[PDB]
A paper describes a structure:
However, analyses of the formation of TF complexes on DNA have revealed that many TFs also bind together across the family boundaries, in a DNA-dependent or DNA-facilitated manner. We also generated an unseen test set by solving six structures that represent several TF–TF–DNA complexes bound to optimal DNA sequences. The structures included two BARHL2 homodimers with two spacings, HOXB13 homodimer and TEAD4–HOXB13, MEIS1–HOXB13 and FOXK1–ELF1 heterodimers.
For example, both RoseTTAFold2NA and AlphaFold 3 correctly predicted the two homodimers of BARHL2.
Author numbering:
A (entry chain A): 231 to 294
B (entry chain E): 230 to 292
Write the structure that this text describes.
Amino acid sequence: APRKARTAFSDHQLNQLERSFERQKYLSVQDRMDLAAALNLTDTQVKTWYQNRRTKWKRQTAVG
Amino acid sequence: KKPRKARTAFSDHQLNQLERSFERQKYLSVQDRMDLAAALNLTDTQVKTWYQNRRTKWKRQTA
DNA sequence: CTAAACGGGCAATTAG
DNA sequence: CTAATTGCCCGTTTAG
């Protein structure tokens, strides 16, 4: 459908999402929702970030 | 809010053909799924669901 | 690059 | 039993 605005994450958001990702490649419902609340992102944003992050990760596992 | 869909009652024939499909191919390509639905006078979704349910059951058998 | 969108699968659940 | 519903993942594609 009409397609929704691309989020531009803040440096603090990107920092803490990279950290979480470093801590954990997958999140529970609970950790996800808490990381969302702590950064003022929606659950979905955080889920799509983590999922997009894995695609890149798998790429770096295929990068050697 | 969204009413639950009626539980499809497949005919003996539809089931036999679904089961024969599954015997050959656990997975259908899109095109194959469309053909088979059309073959059986079913919706693509009816067929996708069946196949999905079927692979579950079959995992319980292989198990 | 990467956020969001897309359809299909998986597991777990719901319910006819 | 099993058809349908849920939330998430994957892999791909779309596009800011």
